[PDB]
Amino acid sequence: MKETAAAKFERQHMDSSTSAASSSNYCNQMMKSRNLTKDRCKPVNTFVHESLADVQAVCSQKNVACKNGQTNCYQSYSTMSITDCRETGSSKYPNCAYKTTQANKHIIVGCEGNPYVPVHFDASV
């Protein structure tokens, strides 16, 4: 089996199957099932509740600097439904624990390839 960087972005950041976080346990559930918490707790992670076609479209939208200075980042015109997963104060590997928060924000992603698609989640703004 092979996993491309594009496929890794889908696993770590896409959930097209729901319009928003489905429960208060959503982040606990997803951080585990998407294998984000293997070797250490990932302290923050964003999931985007939008079609894959709509998120892939961002790579032809507003070119902006990534927060590390690189210039293959793009900001969405549209406002997207997202969930922010943030570690709780009591979270301690291997028993990682997250609070689920909901928002509606533009996203910034880094893009590569043909088709030109997201491979990195930079920020929501």
Side-chain angles (χ1 to χ4, degrees), residues 7-31 33-37 40-46:
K8 181 173 191 173
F9 171 93
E10 295 191 39
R11 178 168 58 76
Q12 296 185 330
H13 302 292
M14 289 295 304
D15 185 5
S16 307
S17 79
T18 60
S19 309
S22 47
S23 81
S24 59
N25 203 53
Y26 177 82
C27 286
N28 286 328
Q29 177 185 315
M30 292 291 287
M31 293 300 277
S33 69
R34 300 296 188 83
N35 298 324
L36 289 160
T37 71
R40 65 169 56 191
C41 301
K42 180 164 191 190
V44 296
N45 191 71
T46 306

